[PDB]
Structures are given as C-alpha cells and as structure tokens.
Amino acid sequence: GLSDGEWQQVLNVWGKVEADIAGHGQEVLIRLFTGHPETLEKFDKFKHLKTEAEMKASEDLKKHGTVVLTALGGILKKKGHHEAELKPLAQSHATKHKIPIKYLEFISDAIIHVLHSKHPGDFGADAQGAMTKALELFRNDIAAKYKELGFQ
Numbered sequence: 001g002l003s004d005g006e007w008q009q010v011l012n013v014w015g016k017v018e019a020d021i022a023g024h025g026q027e028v029l030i031r032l033f034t035g036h037p038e039t040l041e042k043f044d045k046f047k048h049l050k051t052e053a054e055m056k057a058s059e060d061l062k063k064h065g066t067v068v069l070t071a072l073g074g075i076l077k078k079k080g081h082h083e084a085e086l087k088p089l090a091q092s093h094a095t096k097h098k099i100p101i102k103y104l105e106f107i108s109d110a111i112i113h114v115l116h117s118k119h120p121g122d123f124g125a126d127a128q129g130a131m132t133k134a135l136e137l138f139r140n141d142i143a144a145k146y147k148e149l150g151f152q
C-alpha cells in the first residue's frame with residue numbers, strides 16, 4: 001500500500017484537481033481519446049467527436065470528466081479502504097462498458113500527464129511518485145475484480 005506520507009501527498013495533489021474538477025476531467029479524457037482513439041469507441045456518447053476541437057467544445061465530455069474524477073476522488077479519499085466504492089466500478093466497467101484494464105493504464109498515465117501540463121514545475125518528484133502508487137493501487141484492485149469475472 002501507500003505510506004501515510006504518500007497518502008498525504010496524493011490528497012495534497014488532489015487539491016489541484018478539486019479547484020477545477022471539470023477542467024482537469026475534460027483534459028484527462030481528451031488526453032485519453034487523442035492518445036488512444038480506440039478508447040473513444042467504448043463511449044457510444046462520444047464517438048461522434050471527430051476532432052479535438054469538438055472534444056474541447058463538448059459540454060457533455062466536460063460533464064463526464066467531472067463524473068469520472070469525482071468518483072476517483074472519492075476512492076482516493078478512502079486511502080486504500082475502497083472496496084465498496086471500487087467493486088461496483090470495476091464490475092460496470094468490465095460487464096457493462098467492456099473496458100479492458102489496458103485502458104485504465106492509459107487513463108492513469110493521462111492523469112499524470114495532465115497534472116504536469118496544468119501545473120508545470122509544481123508537481124514534484126515525490127508527488128508524482130505518490131500519485132502513481134495510488135493510481136496503480138486503484139488499477140490493481142480493479143484488475144483483481146476483472147480476473148474474478150474472467151474479463152479481458
């Protein structure tokens with residue numbers, strides 16, 4: 001798991017996201033979609049987005065960005081004790097949305113990318129390390145639920 005010092009770093013870094021949840025959420029999804037176009041296909045409601053301009057201009061994408069990060073934020077605030085919050089998400093993403101674990105890897109890297117892009121020089125080495133650990137924990141616990149379901 002993460003140490004108390006690491007969880008404190010994670011939640012301190014999260015303060016940035018919380019100041020502009022929709023902005024960070026939007027940029028995270030845009031980074032995901034632009035870097036990995038196949039991920040867009042998993043969203044029947046965003047597949048109509050053909051350009052990054054259309055993406056940035058989408059209020060609904062911004063809306064989903066807020067939904068995605070608010071959920072992740074709630075999980076992070078649990079500092080590891082997130083089974084109840086994590087289980088349903090892993091299950092809807094495996095059973096309903098069919099999101100391979102690889103895409104969760106992509107979005108994790110996208111979150112790291114967005115923090116550096118929006119806060120250059122203000123996302124220290126220790127901060128990136130702690131946030132990475134937290135995102136790997138989140139990803140790994142979902143992977144467990146995926147194996148349980150036999151989802152690939």
Ligand code: HEM
Nearest residue numbers: 039042043045067068069071072089092097099103104107
């Ligand atoms: C940090 C990771 C993520 C978090 C916390 C998260 C959270 C959520 C939440 C809370 C919902 C709505 C409730 C539900 O259906 O479970 C949702 C829906 C959805 N997510 Fe995720 N998600 C994440 C990553 C991804 C990724 C990488 C994809 C890639 C395709 C994805 C695709 C979807 C789809 C298709 C829906 C349904 C959208 C709709 O309403 O039509 N998610 N997500």
